[PDB]
Structure formats: structure tokens, C-alpha cells
Amino acid sequence: KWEMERTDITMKHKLGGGQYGEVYVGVWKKYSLTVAVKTLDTMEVEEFLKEAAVMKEIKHPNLVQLLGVCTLEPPFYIVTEYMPYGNLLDYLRECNREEVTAVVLLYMATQISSAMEYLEKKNFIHRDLAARNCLVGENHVVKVADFGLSRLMTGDTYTAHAGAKFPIKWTAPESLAYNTFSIKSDVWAFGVLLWEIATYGMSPYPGIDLSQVYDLLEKGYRMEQPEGCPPKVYELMRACWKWSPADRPSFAETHQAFETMFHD
Numbered sequence: 591k592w593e594m595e596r597t598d599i600t601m602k603h604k605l606g607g608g609q610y611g612e613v614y615v616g617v618w619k620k621y622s623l624t625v626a627v628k629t630l631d632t633m634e635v636e637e638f639l640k641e642a643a644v645m646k647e648i649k650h651p652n653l654v655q656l657l658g659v660c661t662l663e664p665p666f667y668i669v670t671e672y673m674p675y676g677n678l679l680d681y682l683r684e685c686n687r688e689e690v691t692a693v694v695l696l697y698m699a700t701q702i703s704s705a706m707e708y709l710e711k712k713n714f715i716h717r718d719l720a721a722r723n724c725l726v727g728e729n730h731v732v733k734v735a736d737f738g739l740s741r742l743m744t745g746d747t748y749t750a751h752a753g754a755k756f757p758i759k760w761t762a763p764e765s766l767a768y769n770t771f772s773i774k775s776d777v778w779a780f781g782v783l784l785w786e787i788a789t790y791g792m793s794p795y796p797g798i799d800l801s802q803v804y805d806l807l808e809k810g811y812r813m814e815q816p817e818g819c820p821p822k823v824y825e826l827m828r829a830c831w832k833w834s835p836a837d838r839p840s841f842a843e844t845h846q847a848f849e850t851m852f853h854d
């Protein structure tokens with residue numbers, strides 16, 4: 591149903607400086623439409639198709655939309671709607687802060703909590719929430735992307751395979767310690783994502799030794815409040831980093847808090 595004919599797309603240039611896979615900007619000739627195209631021998635086919643598959647099952651204004659697949663023969667294609675301003679981390683880092691103000695940061699957070707409220711409702715789990723995995727478009731629209739590790743959950747947790755390796759700065763302690771992933775682990779990451787946004791794209795736990803992060807977190811260390819970050823947003827941010835997953839807010843609560851702030 592989603593399959594398309596590779597001949598349809600014209601591939602113009604490579605897109606990402608090598609950081610996101612083999613992704614090129616594409617022009618769908620017959621529909622006159624700019625699109626992105628992720629392509630894959632690179633023994634990662636199993637996991638590419640898994641990705642192509644999950645994007646068929648989800649649809650939200652703040653999640654990057656699949657337009658079509660070529661997954662009948664190689665090279666395999668993933669054709670998504672094109673976000674002309676790229677990933678959020680570099681956007682924040684390169685933006686004009688007179689244009690991207692505190693209001694715009696709040697808007698970006700609200701839109702992401704929207705995407706995550708929807709996955710939470712769908713009992714899906716993203717597993718790689720971070721500014722580098724969000725994309726920016728016209729009028730400061732932000733959309734969550736990169737669903738390679740995403741899953742529909744059979745119950746309330748998913749256990750990663752032995753020896754899986756994770757981005758530690760974004761990973762919840764129970765995920766580091768017990769390979770346990772849940773919507774509450776996605777909430778932990780969201781918090782770190784909020785800190786990335788608050789700081790216009792700074793690196794979390796700057797200059798800390800990764801092998802000390804768990805240790806520090808268990809002893810209670812958490813990242814300090816960024817300058818300009820409002821107290822309510824910092825309180826919410828800290829809520830996402832509660833040790834016990836149960837004590838963390840839901841994505842519904844979080845989104846309610848930002849929609850309210852976005853008004854007041």
C-alpha cells in the first residue's frame with residue numbers, strides 16, 4: 591500500500607554530513623514535492639525495515655510523516671515529508687536568539703509534549719528522544735523523528751537485549767541499570783531534551799565522565815537550572831528526573847503544563 595517506484599524520486603544532494611545514515615533530499619517529480627529519503631550492502635536491513643514499519647503505524651502533526659517506502663528490492667527507500675530547517679540541536683545552536691525567544695522555546699517544548707502524549711496514549715515508546723532527533727520546519731514547527739528504536743509495547747515495559755549500548759546522558763537510570771524501557775524512561779529523556787532546549791543546544795552534563803553519571807545521579811546529582819529557564823519549567827524538568835519512574839509525570843500532565851504556560 592505504501593510502496594512507490596524509485597524512479598519517482600529525483601535525488602539532488604546528500605543531507606546531514608553523514609550523521610543520520612544515507613539520507614538525501616529528494617524531489618518527487620510527478621507531485622512536484624520536496625521530500626527526504628533515507629536509504630540503506632550494510633547489514634542493517636533488519637532494523638531499517640523495522641523503522642519503515644513503525645512509521646506506517648503512527649500519525650501526528652508533530653511526528654515526521656512517512657510518504658512512502660521502497661522496500662521490495664534494494665536500495666530500500668524511506669520517503670518522509672521534508673523539514674527545511676533540519677535537526678533541532680543544530681538549529682538551536684545556530685539560531686538568532688532575538689528571533690528564537692523564550693516564547694518560541696516554550697512553543698517548541700509544547701509541540702514535542704504533544705507528540706509524546708500521543709505515543710503515550712498509543713502505548714508506544716520512542717527510545718531515542720533528544721534534540722538531535724527532532725526536526726524543525728516553517729514557523730518554528732517542531733516534529734519528533736527517527737523512530738529506529740521505537741515500539742508498540744505489549745505491556746508497560748520493554749527489556750533491551752544484553753550488551754545493548756545507549757546514549758547515557760539521555761538514558762534513565764533504570765534503563766542503564768536493568769535495561770528496562772517504559773514510557774517513564776521516555777519521560778526522563780524528555781527532561782534532558784528540555785534542558786537542551788533551555789540552553790540553546792548545550793551538551794548535557796558537560797565535561798562529566800560518562801562512567802560517573804549513574805553514580806552521580808544515584809547520589810542525587812541533577813543538572814542545574816539554565817539561565818533564563820523559568821522556575822515552573824525547571825520544576826517540571828526536575829520532575830522528569832525523579833529516581834523512581836513512578837514519580838515522574840505522564841506525558842499528558844507534561845503537555846497540560848506547557849499548554850497552560852504557553853498562555854500565562
Ligand SMILES: Cc1cc(Nc2cc(N3CCN(C)CC3)nc(Sc3ccc(NC(=O)C4CC4)cc3)n2)[nH]n1
Pocket residue numbers: 605606610613626627628654668670671672673674675676677725735736737
Ligand atoms: C526526515 C527529514 C529530515 C528532513 N530535513 C532535514 C533537513 C536537514 N538540513 C540540512 C542543513 N540545512 C541547513 C537545513 C536542512 N538535515 C536533515 S538530517 C536528517 C535526515 C534524516 C532523518 N531521519 C530519517 O530520515 C528517518 C526517520 C525517517 C533525520 C535527520 N534533515 N526532513 N525530513
Ligand SMILES: [Cl-]
Pocket residue numbers: 605606607608609610611612613
Ligand atoms: Cl547523514
Ligand code: NA
Pocket residue numbers: 758759760761762763803807
Ligand atoms: Na542518564
Ligand code: NA
Pocket residue numbers: 812827828829830831832833
Ligand atoms: Na530530579
